[PDB]
Every structure is written in structure tokens, then in C-alpha cells.
């Protein structure tokens, strides 16, 4: 009936401070398809975020990739914020370059 | 190419 999203936040390339990259938030395993995904920089919503066209897996659960360009630094914090009907409050997953 | 004959359930 209603499946909660699994979230991964990560960079397209291994991150190096000061080097141009792409921040990804991969949301998957959810049902129904309506979902709110925001990429955050220091807790503030990033404006230029694009996303993939909705598709789904064998078990019918949906998946989407949200992405934007970013340049990692020592001081900035990045994260992805997801809200879905299965969630009480928005779920925030911080970006860690080690994962 | 997509299928031509999708039918109602």
C-alpha cells in the first residue's frame, strides 16, 4: 500500500574540497509516487535542482534521482530532505563524502 | 518502439 523511501545522498565523483562536482539524492523503494525532495546547502534549499523521469522496480516501488552541481568545501554542509505520505516529518540525510 | 494494442482492464 504505502512504502517509505530509502535515501542515498552522494557525489557523482570522489569529493575533493574546491573541485567541481554533482550532488545526488537517490530516493527509491517508495509508493505512492508523490514525493518532495530538496537538496540543502547549510540547511537552505538549493534552487537549480533537476530530477530523473519517474520509473519503478520489479516490486513496483518507484525511484528518482535529484541532482545539482556543487563544489564541496571544508565549511559547507550538504544534505537531502525528503517528505512523503509515509513520513511523520521530513527526513534529512546529511552528505558524507566517505559514503 | 512501444506496443500498438493496449486494451482496457
Amino acid at each position: 500500500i504505502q512504502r517509505t523511501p530509502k535515501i542515498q545522498v552522494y557525489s557523482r565523483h570522489p569529493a575533493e574540497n574546491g573541485k567541481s562536482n554533482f550532488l545526488n539524492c537517490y530516493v527509491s523503494g517508495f509508493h505512492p509516487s508523490d514525493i518532495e525532495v530538496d537538496l540543502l546547502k547549510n540547511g537552505e534549499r538549493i534552487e537549480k535542482v533537476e530530477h530523473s523521469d519517474l520509473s519503478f522496480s520489479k516490486d513496483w516501488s518507484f525511484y528518482l534521482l535529484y541532482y545539482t552541481e556543487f563544489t564541496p568545501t571544508e565549511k559547507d554542509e550538504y544534505a537531502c530532505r525528503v517528505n512523503h505520505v509515509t513520513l511523520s516529518q521530513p527526513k534529512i540525510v546529511k552528505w558524507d563524502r566517505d559514503m | 518502439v512501444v506496443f500498438l494494442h493496449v486494451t482496457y482492464v
Binding site: 542515498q8 505512492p32 | 518502439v1 512501444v2 494494442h5 486494451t7 482492464v9
Partner: protein, 278 residues
């Protein structure tokens, strides 16, 4: 190598106003090549890979007409299903449909499929014989009888074994520079001192295509599953995929552990070990 063509369709009803939200996507293997989005301005099937852009106006007109007919069928189905399940006209519901074909290394037909779901649950699916239907419940049984009467499985079998396969071979030929190129994983290992007497070793596989891959850890040449973490394969966003597998080990014992990578792009499996100087 072995290849597939698959189409995915999702319609979500909008009870407040207007027609359902409809999204269709086409794939060859793990590459998206076409899309249709009812919310997009063009109202046309759109290319998403450079090798499909060479198809002429007759191709795009035909794909647009068919995909719009899919959208209308799902709109009517959403109403039909609401009636079969005795549901109100106030809620949002979803229909999903996936179909496609697989070919082997010789590009000959291996298998076909056509599956339909209502509210994320199996509804009706074509069996592997391409002649009969699996109806999950009594509402789907009503559909199965209608489809048996309308020769639906015959028309699908003709498409899946013929048309689907013939166009897949054309796409594989036109997009050979990418569709037939394997991108072997670019691997490396990282070390993260996680607690007082332990460290996490993380084996990374990046920039690979197709998405299928196996990452496994061994300890002294035997499979290690305890204290391991494997993330689901994820898209890099440039058409390639990524995955990592980690193991928590006692510090000083890193050399007992080896990460093994298997992928279509690797003629021999890869083995990685943490070198103590790094």
C-alpha cells in the same frame, strides 16, 4: 552481450481536476532513450539518448500517437478499477505497466514480459509462455476473461517476439558506440578509523555500466557477511552506476580482508586489499 528493451508507464489519478499525471520511459538495457511526460510542454515522445535522435518524423509521430493511446487506456482503467474495488472518486490511485523483451548474446529472442499493477500491487501479468495470464485476485480475473476474449496475448506475443526484438537489434546497432560498450568499474579502497580498536574498510566501484555487479568481502579467503554493509547500486547521473561494500575490522588485521568485484566489463574478477602505508 545479453540485452533488453523495456517500457515503463505510470498514471496517477488527479481527482480534483483533469486527467491523470502520465509518465512513460523507454530503456535499452540500463540506458533511458525516450520519455513522455503529460506535464511537459511538447506533448511528444522525446529522445533521451543521442543514437535515437536520427529516427525520422514518422517514428516520433507514431511513438507519440501510441503513448497518448496508452495514457487514455490508463485513464479509463483507473475509473474501471475504482469500480472493481468499490473505492471513492475522492482519492488518488495509480496504475503501472511494464513490458519488454530480452535477447541473448546472438541477439535472438530469450523472453518477453507484460505486467500491470494497481496501487503498487500485482494485478495481471502475461505468463512466460506469452499465451496465458496470471490474475492476482477476482477483479484481475474479470480482466483476464476480457483479455482472453479479445486475443490480447496473441497480439502481445507477436509484438514481444517480433517488433520488440527487431527494434531492439536496430537500437543496439545505431547506438553501438555506447550500448555495446561495457564500462568496467573503477575501484578503490578507503579506510575509516571508526572506533577505538576497529576500522571500516570500504571497497568502491564507480563509473560502471551496465548496473549489474557483485561486490563481496572475504576474510582469509572465506566469504565474510558479519559486520559488512552493502549499499544498493545507484546512478552516478552521467549514465553510469556506483556501489560500495564495507567491513569493520580489528585495526592491524586489514591484510586478512579482500574485496572481490565481478562485472561484465572485467575479463578477470578484481581483488582489492588495503595497503598499510596509505
Amino acid at each position: 552481450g545479453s540485452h533488453s528493451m523495456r517500457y515503463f508507464f505510470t498514471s496517477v489519478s488527479r481527482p480534483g481536476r483533469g486527467e491523470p499525471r502520465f509518465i512513460a520511459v523507454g530503456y535499452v538495457d540500463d540506458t533511458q532513450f525516450v520519455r513522455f511526460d503529460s506535464d511537459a510542454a511538447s506533448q511528444r515522445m522525446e529522445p533521451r539518448a543521442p543514437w535515437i535522435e536520427q529516427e525520422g518524423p514518422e517514428y516520433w509521430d507514431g511513438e507519440t500517437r501510441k503513448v497518448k493511446a496508452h495514457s487514455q487506456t490508463h485513464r479509463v482503467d483507473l475509473g474501471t478499477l475504482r469500480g472493481y474495488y468499490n473505492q471513492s472518486e475522492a482519492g488518488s490511485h495509480t496504475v503501472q505497466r511494464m513490458y519488454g523483451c530480452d535477447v541473448g548474446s546472438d541477439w535472438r529472442f530469450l523472453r518477453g514480459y507484460h505486467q500491470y499493477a494497481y496501487d503498487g500491487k500485482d494485478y495481471i501479468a502475461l505468463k512466460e509462455d506469452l499465451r496465458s495470464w496470471t490474475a492476482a485476485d477476482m477483479a484481475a480475473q474479470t480482466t483476464k476473461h476480457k483479455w482472453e476474449a479479445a486475443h490480447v496475448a496473441e497480439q502481445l506475443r507477436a509484438y514481444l517476439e517480433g517488433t520488440c526484438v527487431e527494434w531492439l537489434r536496430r537500437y543496439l546497432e545505431n547506438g553501438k558506440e555506447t550500448l555495446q560498450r561495457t564500462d568496467a568499474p573503477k575501484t578503490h579502497m578507503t579506510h575509516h578509523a571508526v572506533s577505538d580498536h576497529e576500522a571500516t574498510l570500504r571497497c568502491w566501484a564507480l563509473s560502471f555500466y551496465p548496473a549489474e555487479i557483485t561486490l563481496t568481502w572475504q576474510r582469509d579467503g572465506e566469504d565474510q557477511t558479519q559486520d559488512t554493509e552493502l549499499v544498493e547500486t545507484r546512478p552516478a547521473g552521467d549514465g553510469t552506476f556506483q556501489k560500495w561494500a564495507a567491513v569493520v575490522v580489528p585495526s592491524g588485521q586489514e591484510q586478512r580482508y579482500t574485496c572481490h568485484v565481478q562485472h561484465e566489463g572485467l575479463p578477470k574478477p578484481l581483488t582489492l586489499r588495503w595497503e598499510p602505508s596509505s
